[PDB]
């Protein structure tokens, strides 16, 4: 299909038209897109307002044994509208409650029930205790108890560390000596085979006597 291939096939344009499409749209994508008109936010859905003896007659045509709580609020997909007072108007949610509002204004007693809010066992109040900082404070607390444990006997340990460093330095320092002296006497012998008679002064070890080697 060319719509997949993204061709603009509009009829004002080239004369073609997209083949898989409905030939009539009663509301196009823009006015489907506007949900403010469709849904009831901030909008009145019943446009006539009844007098007192009208409201009383309208309430009088409700069958007894009826609760308001049996009429769930329709989802967002469903258009919000009220057909006014028709037969079986109490089945209409928005009509029910709009009438309820007129009955609140006109001072008409409301015979039906009122809307119930069902709640669970585990529900929390609106001003709800915080878990984030309680968490941060308790786990931090845990870290510093650990620090209190780990720091016991720290100063002595840190005293021995320096001694171990000095020892590790000293041993290899004094081994280097015995290495280099046998190296340099080997080089003294390897200078003495080639017959170079090396004086005592130009030797770095200046009390050295080569005849003793």
């Amino acid at each position: 299909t060319p719509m997949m291939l993204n061709i603009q096939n509009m009829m004002w344009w080239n004369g073609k038209r997209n083949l898989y499409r409905a030939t009539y749209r009663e509301k196009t994508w823009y006015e489907i897109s506007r949900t403010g008109a469709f849904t009831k936010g901030r909008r009145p859905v019943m446009r006539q307002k009844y007098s007192r003896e009208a409201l009383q007659a309208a309430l009088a045509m409700v069958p007894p044994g009826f609760e308001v709580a049996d009429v769930p609020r329709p989802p967002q997909r469903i258009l919000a509208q009220s057909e006014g007072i028709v037969g079986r108007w109490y089945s209409n949610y928005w009509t029910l409650h709009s009438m309820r509002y007129q009955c609140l204004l006109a001072g008409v007693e409301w015979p039906l029930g009122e809307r119930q809010r069902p709640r669970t066992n585990y529900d929390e109040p609106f001003f709800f205790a915080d878990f984030e900082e309680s968490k941060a404070i308790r786990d931090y607390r845990s870290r510093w108890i650990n620090v209190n444990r780990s720091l016991v006997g720290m100063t002595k340990r840190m005293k021995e560390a320096e001694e171990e460093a000095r020892y590790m330095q000293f041993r290899k320092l004094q081994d280097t000596f015995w290495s280099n002296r046998k190296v340099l006497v080997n080089r003294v012998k390897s200078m003495y085979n080639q017959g170079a008679r090396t004086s005592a002064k130009d030797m770095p070890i200046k009390t050295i006597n080569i005849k003793a080697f």
Partner: peptide, 22 residues
């Protein structure tokens, strides 16, 4: 439609076909 034409700048009216009918 490797590249889409700018079709938003035209008002909708059908142009006359250039090989115009007699």
């Amino acid at each position: 439609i490797h590249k889409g034409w700018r079709t938003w700048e035209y008002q909708h009216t059908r142009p006359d076909p250039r090989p115009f009918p007699d």
